[PDB]
């Protein structure tokens, strides 16, 4: 039912956006079909974890506060696709960075990123035109999108001096995860589920924000270890954190427990595309028992998650039920 | 006074945005100074025609409807920088297209474009938090920004079939100018001046929209001719429309009055970087007396502008005074 309802609202959102271009923006059929294919390519195929989370939060809050049910569930589906379209926008922007007479494919890629972001505003201005939360929804959405761009600046420039392993600390790693990932992947779906369910001021946002940062931290730590050790055919992609000199959990943890001579070996091999220098870094990670510390670190984080949900259910019982389902997905 | 007030509000906007990053987004001083320099580089140095137009519309409407004066003038300055920041965002996106181990300069350029756009929302959500028009201002702003991205798709793909000179018509040229340029350069400053002056529903938006498209058309036609004939040291840049196979006013006008054999010579030379093929295209433009038709076309457009302002002053006299000043700038 939830996935089937989420996909029906996608067709409704897509048909409005394309017809709006056809009727109000003077677009020709060739470009409408071009944008339909681009929308399907960039927005569909994922797991829709962010979008479905908005639905799960909405349905749990109407079970513990007829016509208001069908409207709130539909409003949550539009908000779910706002995040999915926003994620598709971030992914297109990421493809432009590593992808490199005007090059029309780069022009269309940049244009795709602008259209995907603008579509989040257009679908919200339309389906929520008569909603009292439309102003507050756009402001929290824009602020979280701004947060993500700030986190990308932290992540991209973690190895230099913005006109270098000094910022390779655990607190800066959390700052990167918090702004670059946790806010729009974990906090934003929960907030949007509260907004459409009219139960925004009924929750302790401090514990809600704290759980979102902790769950995003738990997910990013596991994602860092898999990027290094999980082979490509099982991970689904090629792990490239070592070559790209990313501020990963493995890097900042290794630097705290490595000897002075091992740090020199790590610095001399980190951030290189050479096959042996990457293997030398993986060897240093192995010999430091980092995958042993990974299990304990996630266990301690999981305990903080398993216990912070209880603070949230004392005043918001139904809200904590969906947060548990979101944590179980992680 | 207007330019001096516009620059004082810039310092106020910049200081808030950077302090917000420092206080609420956990940003280090090295990156704050990095973003201050980037903001000054991308947002300052232009002519501020879009930003100052918002101020001129605001001051003309308070002269023909104490504390409300200083607030409206300040609100117009924030709206003026919203457009300037938006223009700076478009310019950064344009530099990424022709600019082409992770390349950190492309990553920062993409990050710059996202931050400049988000800053328009942040400065509006802050300085207009207690304004009744904040919701309507964001929606019209987002819709015009969406319009610009649609116009960029029309412009970029005017020579191919979105997965070719058929779309090289005068009506499609107007469509490109209308969506890509006229809406955010001419219509948006006028609308924002009306919003901060509380006189939005007091004007005939049909004539206002019509004047905006005509003025943007008048400006783009002159800009097309200068891109081809004005030498680089006098134009300020290198004209590249012929090499880039742009759907310029010269191209669509030439194709209507050229012989069948001249069209074959135009098609065989258009869109090439060869120095002689570009000169062959300029020769075809010269021999067709296109710079003679350019004077008459602009004169007819100027007549439609000089006469549509009169329809607007019968119900909005003070509003048409600023539209005349904006047209005089063109
Ligand atoms: Br939300 C969410 C729920 C469960 C597990 C992970 C989650 O975050 C992401 C991040 C990237 C891609 N897909 N999901
Ligand atoms: Br607004 C405006 C007023 C007068 C003349 C032109 C205008 O538009 C542009 C376009 C690009 C750069 N600068 N100004
Ligand atoms: Na998702
Ligand atoms: Na301007």
Reduced 3-state DSSP string for A77-126: HHHHHHHHHHHHHHHHHHHHHHCCCCCHHHHHHHHHHHHHHHHHHHHHHH
Query: How distant, in Å, are the alpha carbons of A223, A265, B280, B296 from that of B188?
Result: 44, 57, 39, 28
Spell out which residues of chain A touch residue B134, defining contact as CB-CB under 8 Å. Answer: 135
Looking at the partner chain, which of B107, B147, B161 has a beta carbon nearest the beta carbon of A97?
Answer: B107
Cβ atoms of B148 and B183 within 8 Å: the answer is: yes
Element containing residue A38 per DSSP (H, E) = helix A29-43
Helix or strand holding residue A61 (H, E): helix A49-61
Q: What is the DSSP letter of A202?
A: G
Q: Which residues of A are part of a known binding site? A: 94-95, 98, 155, 223, 227, 241
Among candidate residues B227, B220, B218, the one with its CA nearest the CA of residue B245:
B227
The binding-site residues of ligand 1, defined as CB within 6 angstroms of any ligand atom, are: A 47, 49-50, 53, 185-186, 219, 326, 329-330
How many distinct structural domains can be found in chain B? 1
Asked whether the beta carbons of B154 and B209 are under 8 A apart, the reply is no
Kindly report the length of chain B. 330
CA distances from B209 to A264, B139, B173, B214 (A): 65, 17, 17, 9
Q: Which of B216, B326, B330 to mutate to test the pocket of ligand 2 (most atoms within 8 A of CB)?
A: B330
Q: What is the resolution of this structure in A?
A: 2.1
CB B74 within 8 A of CB B58: no
Q: Are A275 and A282 in contact (CB under 8 A)?
A: no
Pick from A167, A156, A162, A9: nearest CA to A90: A156
Kind and range of the H or E element at A193?
helix A188-196
CB of B325 closer than 6 A to ligand 2?
A: no
Q: Which residue of A has its CA nearest to B136?
A: A135
Place of tokens 């903001």: B39
- Among A213, A198, A177, A183, smallest CA distance to A319 is for A198
Cβ atoms of residues A155 and A176 within 8 Å:
yes
Show the DSSP H helices in chain B as ranges. Answer: 2-24, 29-43, 49-61, 67-98, 104-127, 134-156, 170-177, 188-196, 205-229, 232-235, 249-257, 260-269, 275-287, 290-313, 317-329
What would the two tokens of residue A32 be?
């409408």
Q: SS3 for B244?
A: coil
Range of the domain at A204: 1-330
Query: Between A114, A135, A244, which is nearest B102 by CB?
Result: A244
Cα–Cα distance for residue pair A205/B233, rounded to 1 Å: 58
B266 in Cβ contact with B242 (< 8 Å): no
Q: How far apart are the C-alpha atoms of A228 and A281, rounded to whole Å?
A: 10
**Can you count the helices (H) and strands (E) in chain A?**
15, 0
Q: Which residues of chain A from 104 to 133 reach within 8 Å of chain B, CB to CB?
A: 104, 106-108, 110-111, 114-115, 118-119, 121-122, 125
CB atoms within 10 A of CB B257: 11
Q: For the packed helices B2-24 and B104-127, what is the interaxial angle rounded to 10 degrees?
A: 110
Q: Name the CA radius of gyration of chain B, rounded.
A: 22
Q: Is the dihedral of CA B70, B76, B82, B86 positive or negative?
A: negative
Nearest Cα to A228, choosing from A239, A215, A212?
A239
| Ligand 1 centroid – CA A330 distance (Å) | 7
**CB contact at 8 A, A160 and A121:** no
Asked whether B237 lines ligand 2 (CB < 6 A), one says no
What spacing in Å lies between the alpha carbon of A5 and ligand 1's midpoint? Answer: 20
C-alpha span between A174 and B132 (Å, rounded): 38
Provide, as residue numbers in chain B, all residues whose Cβ is less than 8 Å from the Cβ of A143. 121-122, 125
What residue's CA is closest to ligand 1, atom 2? A49
A181 CA to centre of ligand 1 in angstroms: 10
Contact A153 B103 (CB under 8 A): no
Residue of minimum CA distance from atom 11 in ligand 2: B185
Measured in Å, residue B185 CA sits from the centre of ligand 2 at 7
* Chain B environment of A134 (Cβ under 8 Å): 135
Sign of the Cα pseudo-torsion (B153, B157, B158, B162, in order)? negative
List the one residue out of B101, B162, B289 whose CA is nearest residue A273. B101
What are A307-311's contacts with CB under 8 Å, separation 24+? A308/A207, A308/A210, A308/A211, A308/A214, A309/A211, A311/A204, A311/A207
Residue A83 token pair = 């995040």
B79: CB partners within 8 A, 6+ apart = B54, B124, B137, B192, B193, B195, B196
Query: Which positions ≥6 away from B182 have C-beta within 8 Å?
Result: B212, B213, B215, B216, B217, B220
Which chain B residues have a beta carbon less than 8 Å from that of A146?
Answer: 115, 118-119, 121-122
């Amino acid at each position: 039912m939830p996935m089937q309802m989420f996909m029906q609202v996608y067709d409704e959102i897509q048909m409005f956006l394309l017809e709006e271009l056809e009727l109000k923006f003077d677009m020709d059929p060739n470009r409408v079909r071009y944008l339909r294919k681009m929308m399907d390519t960039t927005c569909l195929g994922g797991k829709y974890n962010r979008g479905l989370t908005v639905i799960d939060v909405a349905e749990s809050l109407l079970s513990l506060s007829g016509a208001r049910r069908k409207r709130v569930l539909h409003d949550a589906c539009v908000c779910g696709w706002m995040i999915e379209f926003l994620q598709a926008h971030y992914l297109v922007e990421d493809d432009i960075m590593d992808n490199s007479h005007p090059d029309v494919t780069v022009q269309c890629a940049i244009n795709d990123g602008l259209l995907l972001k603008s579509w989040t505003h257009m679908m919200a201005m339309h389906f929520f035109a008569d909603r009292p939360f439309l102003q507050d929804l756009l402001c929290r959405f824009n602020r979280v999108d701004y947060t993500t761009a700030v986190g990308q600046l932290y992540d991209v420039t973690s190895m230099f001096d913005s006109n270098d392993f000094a910022e390779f600390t655990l607190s800066n790693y959390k700052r990167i995860v918090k702004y670059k990932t946790a806010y729009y992947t974990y906090l934003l779906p929960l907030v949007m589920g509260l907004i459409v369910s009219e139960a925004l001021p009924t929750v302790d946002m401090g514990v809600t924000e704290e759980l979102a940062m902790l769950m995003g931290e738990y997910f990013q730590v596991q994602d860092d270890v898999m990027d290094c050790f999980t082979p490509p055919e099982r991970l689904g992609k090629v792990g490239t954190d070592i070559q790209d000199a990313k501020c990963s959990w493995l890097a900042v943890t290794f630097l705290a427990k490595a000897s002075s001579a091992q740090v020199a070996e790590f610095k001399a091999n980190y951030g290189s595309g050479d096959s042996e220098k990457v293997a030398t870094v993986r060897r240093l990670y192995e010999e430091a028992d980092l995958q042993g510390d990974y299990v304990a670190y996630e266990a301690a984080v999981a305990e903080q998650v398993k216990e912070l949900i209880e603070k949230l259910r004392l005043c918001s019982p139904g809200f904590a039920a969906s947060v548990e389902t979101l944590w179980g997905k992680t």
